[PDB]
Amino acid sequence: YHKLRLAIKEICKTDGIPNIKWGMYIAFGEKLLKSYLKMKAGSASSDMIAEYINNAISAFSSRTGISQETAQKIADFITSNY
Ligand SMILES: [Cl-]
Numbered sequence: 793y794h795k796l797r798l799a800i801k802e803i804c805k806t807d808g809i810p811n812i813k814w815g816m817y818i819a820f821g822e823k824l825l826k827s828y829l830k831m832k833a834g835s836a837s838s839d840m841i842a843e844y845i846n847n848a849i850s851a852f853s854s855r856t857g858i859s860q861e862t863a864q865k866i867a868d869f870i871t872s873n874y
Pocket of ligand 1: 793795
């Protein structure tokens with residue numbers, strides 16, 4: 793997901809994310825994209841997709857030094873581009 797990784801880095805720069813943390817946001821985004829595409833391909837409902845995304849953002853944002861707002865921007869980039 794070369795294009796995604798690039799886009800996540802730009803989101804990280806905009807949000808002033810400490811660079812030691814970027815790998816974590818990249819991994820979160822790449823994993824979420826793969827799961828989102830699988831769910832779309834299989835005609836998951838809107839409710840199911842929202843629940844999965846919200847669960848992913850909740851779990852990731854529960855880590856210290858991680859921003860829920862930036863996690864949400866990444867999810868939003870995915871759902872608006874893929
Ligand atoms: Cl990509």
